[PDB]
Every structure is written in structure tokens, then in C-alpha cells.
Write a protein that binds this ligand. Structure first.
Ligand SMILES: NC(=O)c1ccc[n+]([C@@H]2O[C@H](COP(=O)([O-])OP(=O)(O)OC[C@H]3O[C@@H](n4cnc5c(N)ncnc54)[C@H](OP(=O)(O)O)[C@@H]3O)[C@@H](O)[C@H]2O)c1
Ligand SMILES: O=C(O)COc1cc(Cl)ccc1C(=O)NCc1cccc([N+](=O)[O-])c1
Length: 315
């Protein structure tokens, strides 16, 4: 199936378009092309600084009669500097205004860590440490629940939460909505078997981000492992007459994950969608899982001391 059922009764497309590092000058066209070739899910965030341009694309294709709103599944995320309960609605409405939408299908707490409120996305002190805010996960979650109650968003979820942090929410007395989704890094070098097992056992859908290894991440080092260039994965792709990326997107699909590869290149956007016409075998799957190195492309050492930093726990 093309979509997976969430706890709110809504269906989420298992393939979506990522937008981190899609420049505003190019993401409008990316999203238009993606909608043309069949994408219905777009992964957004305020911190990506391109939601206006994403919203221009969606507006235009609605106006062209290519899709209607109900067919789209638009996700955004509350940034770390807005975790205070008084700031959450404002942040959500800014995102809605930028995207020119009147609801989000899914709104996530982008990271469990709250940062000092202000204009800077990464507020630092004079020695480079990220400055935290005195906010906590449960209070932030209650503020997210209010967004559902007011119809701003149809579902809420989390991102980059370890299983203890997910448990905190599940075990909150008076909880009103369980998280629908946990969006985490996931690829053959970081296969997340225990966190996926946990999440799926609790009825939480998992979305895999950076499925191609985020080669464009701004802190990459030349010597870092490179998924798209891994000759072992290229070999699996050649035997299916598919590209490495296609293999890398199909892999989490077969683990009952949602997956959100990013591109601004029209040919790659189309290429990446062409993943429902082949199957990785059992051996392929076993092989790809065996490449795990517990290697993360997305972390922040300047915030390692945060009380809620998620990656000290095993999972
Ligand atoms: N929740 C969070 O904390 C979080 C964190 C990271 C990412 N995410 C979401 O996950 C999405 C995907 O992750 P990501 O952006 O880190 O990286 P990714 O999707 O793993 O990889 C994106 C990179 O791969 C290139 N690429 C795309 N398709 C390709 C293909 N068929 N062949 C060769 N290269 C290809 C892209 O280049 P071009 O674009 O130049 O074509 C870009 O450089 C993000 O955009 C964001 O929406 C969420
Ligand atoms: O967050 C994302 O979606 C992708 O990562 C981005 C994106 C942009 Cl626009 C800017 C900066 C980052 C980045 O340093 N993210 C890592 C990060 C941030 C905060 C906390 C953590 N943390 O580990 O607590 C990690």
C-alpha cells in the first residue's frame, strides 16, 4: 500500500519529499515537479527557511487543478526556540501562514531539546554552547495537543526522541493524544532496530529521514561514510536495474516505515518516486541491515549537555 494508517484515522503516504537544504530559489520548482510526478507528502520545517516557497508551489498546483488539499499530506515541525507553551501556537500559525494552509496533516516536535527563545535558531553562549530553555517535554506536548483541539493540525508527533522520551509522553497522566509518528534518522549505517521495534510496538508510525545519508549536510567531512557511493549497495541496485538511491528508499518502505528523500533536481525527484515497481529480496534486506554502524549524520555536539539531548541513551 502507498499509505499507512495513523492513530487519528488518517492515512499517510509512505513516500514524501524532503525539503531541508532545498534553497528557496529552487524549492518551488522542486515541489511543483514532485506533485506532477505523484508525490502527495511533503516534509517541511520552519527552521528550513523555505516554507513560503513550498507554500507557493502547493498553491499553484491546487489552482492548476492537479491536486486538491485533501490529497496532500503536509508535515511541519515546531523549532527548539518555541517550546515554551505560550509560543507554540504562534509558531504553528507562522508555519501555516507561510505554507498558505489552514491546517497541517502532521505537526512534530522537531527535537526534544528546548533552546533559549529569541530570533536565533541556535542561540549560543560566548564559548559555543547552545543555550537551553527551561522547558520540558511534557508541557511542550500539552501545547501541541491544544493545536489539534483547535483544528490547526490533524495529528501531532515527535522527532529525534529516544524511547525513554517517547515513554515520558505515553505515560503522562491525562494524556489527550498519543504521538502518531516519531521521525528519526534511519538508513543502512543507522538501522535503528530497537527504536523502531519500540515505536511500532506502541502503535507509533516511524518516518526515516536522511535515507540517502544526507550527503549535502553542511557539517560533512570527506572521510565520512557515504551511502550513495557504497559499492556494496551499488551492487544490489545493479542486480535490480535500479539506482542506489532507489534501493535506499525502497529499503525502509519494506520495514513498514515512511521515508522522505530530499532532492531539488527534477530528474532525481522523479527517479526517487519510481520505487513501487520492484521488491528487495529477503537477502537484500538482511544484507542492508547488516551494514549498520550506529553512525549518525544528524546530531549537535554543542548541545550534548542538554538535559533532553536524545542520543546518550542506547535507543
Ligand atoms: N526531523 C529532523 O530532525 C530531520 C533531520 C534531517 C532530515 N529531515 C528531513 O529528511 C529529509 C531527507 O533527509 P536529508 O535532506 O538529510 O538527506 P537525504 O534525503 O538523505 O539526501 C539528500 C541529498 O541526496 C541527493 N540526492 C537526492 N536524490 C538523489 C538521487 N536519486 N541520486 C543521487 N543523489 C540524490 C540530494 O541532492 P539534490 O537535492 O541536489 O538533488 C541531496 O544532496 C530532509 O530534507 C528533511 O525533510 C528531518
Ligand atoms: O534538524 C533538522 O531537521 C536537520 O538538521 C539541521 C537543519 C538546519 Cl536548517 C539547521 C541545523 C540542523 C542541525 O544542526 N540539526 C541537528 C540538531 C539540532 C537541534 C538539536 C539536536 N540535538 O541533537 O539535540 C540536533
Amino acid at each position: 500500500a502507498s499509505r499507512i494508517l495513523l492513530n487519528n484515522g488518517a492515512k499517510m503516504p509512505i513516500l514524501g519529499l524532503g525539503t531541508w537544504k532545498s534553497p528557496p530559489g529552487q524549492v518551488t520548482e522542486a515541489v511543483k515537479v514532485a506533485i506532477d510526478v505523484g508525490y502527495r507528502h511533503i516534509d517541511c520545517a520552519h527552521v528550513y527557511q523555505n516554507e513560503n516557497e513550498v507554500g507557493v508551489a502547493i498553491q499553484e498546483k491546487l489552482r492548476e487543478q492537479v491536486v486538491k488539499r485533501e490529497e496532500l499530506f503536509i508535515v511541519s515541525k515546531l523549532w527548539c526556540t518555541y517550546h515554551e507553551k505560550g509560543l507554540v501556537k504562534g509558531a504553528c500559525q507562522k508555519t501555516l501562514s507561510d505554507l498558505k494552509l489552514d491546517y497541517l496533516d502532521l505537526y512534530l516536535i522537531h527535537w526534544p531539546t528546548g533552546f533559549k527563545p529569541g530570533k536565533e535558531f541556535f542561540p549560543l553562549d560566548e564559548s559555543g554552547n547552545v543555550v537551553p530553555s527551561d522547558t520540558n517535554i511534557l508541557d511542550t506536548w500539552a501545547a501541541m495537543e491544544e493545536l489539534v483541539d483547535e483544528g490547526l493540525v490533524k495529528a501531532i508527533g515527535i522527532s529525534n526522541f529516544n524511547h525513554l522520551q517517547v515513554e515520558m509522553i505515553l505515560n503522562k497522566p491525562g494524556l489527550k493524544y498519543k504521538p502518531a509518528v516519531n521521525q528519526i534518522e534511519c538508513h543502512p549505517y543507522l538501522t535503528q532496530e530497537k527504536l523502531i521495534q519500540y515505536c511500532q510496538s506502541k502503535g507509533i508510525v516511524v518516518t526515516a529521514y536522511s535515507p540517502l545519508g544526507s550527503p549535502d549536510r553542511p557539517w560533512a567531512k570527506p572521510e565520512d561514510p557515504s551511502l550513495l557511493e557504497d559499492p556494496r549497495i551499488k551492487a544490489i541496485a545493479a542486480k535490480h536495474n535500479k539506482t542506489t538511491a532507489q534501493v535506499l528508499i525502497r529499503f525502509p518502505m519494506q520495514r513498514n516505515l515512511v521515508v522522505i528523500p530530499k532532492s531539488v533536481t527534477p530528474e532525481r525527484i522523479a527517479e526517487n518516486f519510481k520505487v513501487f515497481d520492484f521488491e528487495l529480496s529477503s537477502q537484500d534486506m538482511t544484507t542492508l541491515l547488516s551494514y549498520n554502524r550506529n553512525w549518525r549524520v544528524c546530531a549537535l555536539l554543542s548541545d550534548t549537555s542538554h538535559k533532553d539531548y536524545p542520543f546518550h541513551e542506547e535507543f
